[model samples]
Target: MQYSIEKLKKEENSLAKDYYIYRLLEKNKISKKDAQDLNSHIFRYIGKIKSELEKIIPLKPYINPKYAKCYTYTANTILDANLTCQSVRLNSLVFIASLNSKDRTTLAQTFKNQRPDLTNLLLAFNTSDPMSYIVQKEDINGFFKLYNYSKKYDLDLNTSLVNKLPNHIGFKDFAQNIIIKKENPKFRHSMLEINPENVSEDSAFYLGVNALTYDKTELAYDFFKKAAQSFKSQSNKDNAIFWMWLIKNNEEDLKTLSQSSSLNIYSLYAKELTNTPFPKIESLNPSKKKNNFNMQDPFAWQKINKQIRDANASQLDVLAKEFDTQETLPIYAYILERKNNFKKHYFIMPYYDNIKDYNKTRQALILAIARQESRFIPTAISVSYALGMMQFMPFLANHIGEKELKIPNFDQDFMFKPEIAYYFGNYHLNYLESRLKSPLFVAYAYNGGIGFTNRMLARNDMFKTGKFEPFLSMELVPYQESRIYGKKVLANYIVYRHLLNDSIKISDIFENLIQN
Candidate 1:
């Protein structure tokens, strides 16, 4: 039967009732104290109603075929109302965490008997205790089992449970299979230079960097030396020269380049590698200043934000331009996002703290996403019309409104407002974080949707060695925009951790990646 969106909104004991009671008191249908007291019950019954919704009806014998096959209004109504009543949904999920391994087993049995899918395995997902007897002993079905279903629909992926599973593959080896042994992707540039003129000397600069990343010192030198030959941008030239000095193959060559490399970042890296301090120049004698440049027009973002709130394609395109410095670029990116335009990293540092309601640690990671989504531009928009700092799609914004914010109408403009965008973005991140321990999967879920995130993760089956294979499952996230976004966001998380906390730890980031 077609779902009645209207019926769902009016179903029994929905939050609709809570607001009704509150409004009744407001209009003097009930005493203020009565409304307040009943509202208190509303909070607790929210969970009870959630449990009730899951309460199933027994099938009647010799019923009409059509009637017998149909879901009762009671069941469908709660399911429908859930679209507008995420509180019931949220409370129901939290209810699972509250139960123990044994109680969780009983609950799952009530839902589906003898099914290893939800009950037996889920008991330990959010439990503090590690008695995974249910998971290890009972739920190990002989046949195929797609363990993790979704962020919510699947088995528990919390690191506490995932890492401690009796035996599973090592994550580092799994990562190496994809990141190291796997063939590098063929970008347009690598396939005979996509934009020869537009790409220019940066072509060599990019290839040199690519070669360096691939760890071929000779190839790196070949490209960097070419990049140093003649480039309009001295910064690119200096960077090319700098990378040449940064190579690791030969001591004499490295030493020579270190002596010649003068830019602050490269020179410092060269000194660290060679153990020699060369003459430190105050600044580069180039077109751009090496020290710092302040491009902040303090009121500019505010004005642009106001303009974008009601902008058309013409005005949005008109506002889009090359505002080259750190400050202006983020602003430029913000405008680009309002127009659902697509497009970075370092200049976004301070902006990390600008988005409100996040702790510093979360701020560091959230900014990594923001940076990847739109280079720290609050108004960043995607071609798919993913709006705001985290590039939330409109449907997602609507869902967040109904499921998370409990708001009625969905507005694309609400997303362009940085405050609305960050609120929902951060909440969604938290939802994923609660369901799964890995930051990688959380990033994966945010862009790919919880459905495909579960699909990718489902590839890792239970091993006799112990646990599920999260890293192995990631290989399954093959073709999609989320593939690149997930990897970039994870890498950026490590980068931002270093930038924000001033600690460089590649291994620490990797260690925390796969949970336990």
Candidate 2:
């Protein structure tokens, strides 16, 4: 096959294009001269292509951190050098965390001054000095590795390390492994003694939640207030405010919360308290005109989104018209919504008729998950590589694809197709729904995993009948993404159920959360 280098160069750069090049190179389909012509292009998904091109092109002076995969041997090769750039050295730490103890010790001593924080981690793994092993500063991957190392050796890493790591590093695991090990009185005392400067908003939020669990309302209120004021997003702020509202039973706070535009679970809860009905959502009716937009091609989707992102308000309106066909109504709606031009068209139903045979509740659940996952975009890919409208991770996608669907030699690109994404999504939802009866719990299991939801349900402090009951339990879910995602999905479910003519209310669902 005579592949045209010029033709390939003219096409939009994307994971698909990258994979095309990878396939050609893997089979030695491209000549060496042609391969060197693409020398300037950096590969993000394929590692072997990068290494092979290195042999034909000029050898770079240092390792490129942007290259996709880094292994233990790659770290060993980089650290074996007498000297390397700081960025490369830091990048190597992720892989180095898995290296043997002797090599870790040598590298720790070698780069002590250049990268003390990472070196502290290496020493943390090698020796018993708690002070030396204490994370010098928060590095997410460094903290994760150190956390695992501490768990393996049963070492009580400094509590300050808790605040040092970024808030998103699964504080729940740290709480279970380290903080929960202490007796109630000692744990409360230790939490109170920690300096305010050392605590991140997420750390403060975790501490506050634990304070409530231990019957320390004063400490819980103080930390929750701090987190409410300083938290990054309004949704997270609303979470903390709801906790305070639970403590004080203040209608004033509920009134203030009812005014939030984020329309998240907390604000929706506030609105329900005031008897405010769910907002009327509007959808753009699809045009009869048809175009050649390839919904399955990730490259096309990426290109459109890039244009939409860089477009001005007027350009966005124009782009909406350009994509207003029946096949691309969702894309059109996305463009208009970006500029806040049309909130009414934000929830268009592209695949509603396809699932007409499904149960009303099931139909609503699928639509709700699709809206939250990718806004009905068939070619969506998350930062973590969750693919398509339903956002199935690769591992789970593979399982559902090969085993359940009985499709041998499955290709991942199939996931980008709406039919496959919806089918696989529905099948996976069946798996989750079999064990969990509540739509809200199913959303949690969908986002976080069934095991996480199961473990959470087993805890006495969560979802049990009490003052806050289920609302407090919602805020206390360990993973932040799942906590917020469950709320958004449930909100979407209520709206979709109403849209599908089932007429289920959001408050009705919340009222039965404990029993369900």
Candidate 3:
């Protein structure tokens, strides 16, 4: 054990290093002195640890206050230790958070009043007596944490706690869980008592959506009306009217919904209901003018965007003309939308020379994804660090770049190039299409991982032919990003297919999803 511990200590510090030490400690292979020597090294890397390691490591000494917020160990022994340092105290709160209700209540009781915010959170976990914690007006983050904690546990939330639920946290999800899961009746009643002024459009809209899901038609109608009346956005207003018409067959609401300028699933549905013609979309005119913009450089795009933001209306017209070349179609599309020029559609094929020789459906699918992912911007990077127009995550991009694309010493910046983005995007889509034949399912697999889409498809209740089916199934896709993303991409695919001379109706496509 001593030899192994020495060998490990000399090696680089990593999870593997910690694990090797942990195994030795677990098997009673190390002496007390050796264990003490390794304590600081092991404790520095510890997160969720084995009981043996938990017992030996003292709670206060190794606490890294700078990184305390990242610690998530939840051992009962650590909770019982005398932890007074703010770092240990913060870590203890994490322990409390991860513990089950029984352990949580007991530990929280022992560590009260070291900090009011901590004490408030600890006391707030009392499901039986939630009123035990006083709500502080300044502790908005604490209040949100309390709300999340309650939501996570499905614990009883009294009127006082419920009233303090800030409207800005996007209450739609909470409203969905309460109605769809039907677990928190007490919390639901309290939420109902919140002032109408405080109720978000999302809360009202989801209330209606879930109500319809459960066949509570009257309740759905009422909430949908509330959502329709909100002055939040035209899209929300149109969506509520669309849902209301679905329930009561109201001609007026259907007519109003059909008039929306936005091209979304709801508006398209309204158009189909009224037999209205799809909007005529003009292809962006390709440019023959020679230009020198470095389209592959992200820094260049960043600088150009800064200039675009500061440019006045007349200057925007000048900038638009400069970017109106074939290579810079994406930048031109962005400028057109920014300048409120909707007459010329923003949808345009930029990498035609690259994709023109590919299979027709494959080309459309690639375009559909690129449109949704980065609006066809080759140098785009997502907040989660997904790179390029097709939004491939780092790990996936690495594997495909090295193993599949055979690019030596692959860097993520290669993804910023249109040819690389399109090639890898198509390669990944081929793997997805092997598992999922439908464009909708492939879109789901593309956005949410392939594993997620598979698990969702395995469920008996989803994507099956039934009343309000495919749309309801689309809405109820567990991950919110993939849910809305799948719809947008599906719409994009239909339009792109039409542009490629492989026209398909949106209605026919969705129905085919369930039928075949």
Candidate 4:
């Protein structure tokens, strides 16, 4: 049965009351505060369990600290009820091993000498200091040696260790380039597959989207056709139809179908794909010319300020109100303060005239993306060679730099400059806005690019026809990071918007502003 928070709360209250009564009956020792706290924790646990239950189970392998805490408390409660000693010990050991490093170490040391089985010691090593012997450059042989030793000695190994262990000598390479690839091959295949009906509608749509990223028109076309036929959901069918319209290349048919369709999935897709008032994809291209600004001159700030002032006051008020209330602003501000002087961070004045303008959403979206990408650190670099606050790849950033903005000494060093980073980041946002139209679609495009977003739109149409589930069935977007990034950025946008005002709801934003 699905768990409901309200139902869970009632259950938790009953459990807490019983627990308190039992304690009182045994030793006349039950504090009201303790009862309340215990009930609250239980309710929280119920909520977490509900969320976990909704997803494909055998839940994620990683152990959450909150889950560990609840498990330990509940285990003790069971023991207090005269559960077997073995059960208590087993539960406690599992909870202890999953704890944070400091706690894990303490538990390990305390139990190691008493147990003498190396199980606790192994758990300690794995949980408290996994990196001690697992070097970044280590081969599969090194990993296997460690794994074998732990196994032979009766060590507690995390489920992730077995699931992620490498088989070849080139452990790191195999894990990155081969193993992960093999595991997500369906994703790759979906991308290459053109006939959506031949596979699953959602899968075909996703595959088509993946093909679009590399401009594989024939593959994308085939996939969209399959999506239109295969999808069982009305929404999915609409999405498929939308994709067909987008790549149809015949303007008359595009206009005819667009007008005939209601502002449901197909119409929304067409509007986003063809809208002109919307930001153009050219803006995101690295080869596009950028609006020039003199960075050294203080008047540049004044000019921006003046431009903002010239915008409609009512719109500005709404935007300012939204900004003032936004929850993410504080977190973002705090991160900025930690990374650099707060004074250095200029607040992008909300374009109030376009207060409802998707651009405002873009601003928040980019900020959230920056937070995830670099934690607001301008000089951050990733292992994948992405750099700056936005973490743009060198080639992409250079392409943008050459056409969009003038750099006196255009080199890798320029990526570290806050102004340069912000400029390129905004440019990317502008590009997405043009291609996707809606802020949410633009946000998706920002992560996966316009081509992918367009393809997904088509697939979503097919899914509406009962082709597949909206997110899960879409097979083309194989890259976990990109798929997750899109969802997170949209979620972050909602969080950011809520921070602006309690009255503002995520559903309202998507439904009223973006959906049509």
Candidate 5:
């Protein structure tokens, strides 16, 4: 190893604290709270642009005891204050990691008395119930409640919170035994899984997507082509087109997309490839279309959202045909994404206007993360119980809220609310970018954890290049989930940047790379 895992961790954590200071301030500003999150003169420069503010703050790996106490006290006061519902639950979750029994008690009592419904969720974790993790995963609010409930009253669930985590290195080890063969199993299976067994569209698409990693151009391209031709969704078509570009390196496919295709997300990528001074692929300015929605009704938004979340696509399609305008396009797009509706359908845009004003680079990453996590579904949940558009697990969300917001009662359900999820999600992407600054690393850290990422980097052969190497490091990812997660998140980020009119290339991020 070029660097010991211990040293890599030390370096990573050092940068993380600096980011935490900045992220803490940003959260305060957005949450409309007084900036007690990082109370210090050194933090006085917090509100400036990210690039400008970062110059003033230094990342000291070790904290001065006195200054550290100031952070702890500020965090302590936030946790102790009057709060209820999800906020209290979330705060309790944060405190569990580093707090006294007294504080944990106060949090438990506060929740049990103030919000018994949450208390019920807490008790649910005291078993090997898979649903607890599922419910807690997206139920970010419920997650903290479960953890705080366990800590406050001294309960031990059969499955520890961290242990149940799908991306926990322990669980990541699950994929170690999954892929068949001493070679790679992501592509082929049993040496003949792709034999001409009467090809089906879904089968071809699966094989095609799986084949990319194995570098089987003909197998991947032929199947992906068949898959694209079969799909009604333009999103699916563009997705196949993308795979072809990846496999064949034919510039014409993308060039035609950029020049001829109307304003859509796929066209944006092709536009970048076809044009040098990449023209901004602006939003598809939808012409006003008539809709029959009961604008007079108070429950219109809720009713429509419910259909998207619960009802089928035809339900929304009828609604879309009736009234697909600029305002409603995002709704349809979000709905379509849920249905895996791709190909020419580029209705996804910034749904929430409350998006923070950052350097804009990180904002694109936020969009990328949201799209990758839940395909932009606010109420999206994973089998692992990762919740919302951001797919934040409880432990991750709790860690974030406690470290940055220091408040205990923020509702985990807010993870389902678009702006709030983006708020915290944006804060998270900025923190990750500040330290490792690689989409691969940021995505890995987001999916796995920074602690795991630290060790991944410490492996000398993984990044044998003198500098940080995403392509090489990505291949070496121990977890199959993270390996693929890194690639998708980075690609998603690249597309979002182009849509946002950013002309930057993927390699540009490598230039901002951290050297260990």
Candidate 6:
């Protein structure tokens, strides 16, 4: 039962094919008999090869690379497995799972050639135990470090295997950097901070902002200028110039800076601020306004629409039409019906259709929420680690399912399952509704976190009758996306309710449906 590296490498090709076959079987796209046959063939050779490999290179370092030689051999085996296209199973999963805690950086660096494969292999492994060693020990900083590494090298994270932490301090910053960086200079700062210090000059420019936050304006200006100076490459100079102006912000200095640099920084600044009034002497006093330093929230929908418009016209047209005409529920149903089989219907139909139950309303609400969150794409992933149709972070999805629904061994893939998504989406929707008592409020809570929404409500109370106004008041709503999404979903729900009520006008439902 011994296998050489060459023998294992040769046999691994067939094992890779079998692995795809197994995936097809698990997805029910193929027969179990075929999957079992392939599994047996792959396993027979895999077991022997694995045994021999272990004899030569012990498995202990595969979990913790304190033994560099052992870990290097293990990494080579993984790289070979990847080259052969072999699908990794529980053994590989367990090895990496154990190693995730022990100095992963050393193992990662030692096997740099195989780092891509190693990362992919590690992410593929999953376990059901809620209190697993990796889950308990994983910290936010560690998760972000791994996440940044994966992004830097353009590797997939198989997010299904990892648990997402709630109230993740970095999530908001991550989202802003990836999705909103173009319009917001603040987001650019956040993104730069997430990278290693020695990244590109452009990234370094932003990194300086991240490090300095607000106080190091001069240092940030210098970094931006450097990035602009390094922009001999086409199309890159424009961005560097924009950043330069954003940080510099002085008329005479900007003119001199632009003349000394290849980038059109001064011109760009003039274009943006030409008509705007410069601050007066009175306004220079810090106490002129109580909250003048607080950043103004941008209009997210308008910006997103502008982005879509700037891209392919056909795609933007479709998105615009979908946003304008289709009801939210039908839009979700359309996406689901179009993308994947309606296997979820089997579990949900009974509760919603025949039973004449509250679950139907719950499902409708959940669908609306999900559509607003991710447009019903099961593979939909966000820059902030939100995944799947319901955009449940692995942690939130696991916690809600295990604690609320009593489901055991939940993982990220569970978010892809229709029944699981529907259940969790509905439960969270209802939870938010009970606390906020307004559809719009709950929708906002769902996006911005309940605590943020409540604080806004409290602020509105202080400004008004010394009592909190209902959450629907425009004055209480903040966070541009949450506010817009809340309104859009409410509008969408009205349309959906009309569809269920035989094509009644949505306007009527909005006026009449409110219980208060």
Clash pairs for candidate 2: 282-344
TM-score-superior candidate, 2 or 6: 2
Which window of 10 residues has the lowest lDDT sum in candidate 6? 278-287
Candidate 3: what lDDT? Answer: 0.70
Could you give the candidate ranking by lDDT, starting with the highest? 2, 3, 5, 1, 4, 6
Candidate 4 or 1, higher lDDT: 1
Q: Against the true structure, what is each candidate's TM-score?
A: 0.37, 0.69, 0.70, 0.32, 0.45, 0.32
RMSD (Å) per prediction: 19.8, 7.3, 10.6, 21.5, 20.0, 20.8
Candidate-wise lDDT, in order: 0.47, 0.70, 0.70, 0.45, 0.53, 0.44
User: Per-residue lDDT for 219-295 in model 3, tens only?
Assistant: 77787788889747776687678778878888988888887876766777778778998766756775455479988
In order of listing, the candidates' clash counts read 10, 1, 0, 41, 17, 2
- Residue-wise C-alpha lDDT for candidate 2, range 1-516, written one tens digit per residue: 223556666666665456556556656767777876695443363456576666556564664555323323355465554444323445544455566688777777877887776677777656554333454443556656554544443323346644444354565456533433333343344555444455556667767777776677777777777888888877778878878787877787777777766656777778878987776676677655667888777778888888999998889878877788988877877887887843342566786666888898998999999999999998887655678889888779888788777797786667877888888888889989999878889999998899989998898766878766777687677676888788889878877877888977567787778852
lDDT of 6 by residue, 300-396 (tens): 2223424543546355445434433222332323333323332222011211332235544554566567656755544444544465667886568
**Residues 1-516, model 5: lDDT tens digits:** 123222222332222233333344444432323222322323123334233344444345575553443344433574644453224334344444444445544554667866654444444433455234434444434533443344223222233332233323222222233221123332134222343233434444555644544556677778677766776555556656666665687887676555643333445556666654443332545577535554222124435665666757667666555445654554556655565543343525546475646655677788878877876656554544466778887567877777668856764545766776888888887788688766768889999988888888786655554322433344347776887677677767776666666747654654444355
**C-alpha displacement of 515 in model 2, angstroms?**
6.4
Residue-level lDDT tens digits of model 1 in 59-88 = 244545544323232322433432223122
lDDT of each residue in 389-499, candidate 4, tens digit only: 677876778788775566665864466566677667777877777766655566566666678677766643322322222322232344556655655555455444433
Stretches > 4 Å off in candidate 6: 1-356, 461-476, 502-516
How well does candidate 3 match the true structure, expressed as C-alpha RMSD?
10.6
Judging by lDDT, tell me the better candidate of 1 and 6: 1
TM-score of candidate 5 versus the correct structure, residues matched by position: 0.45
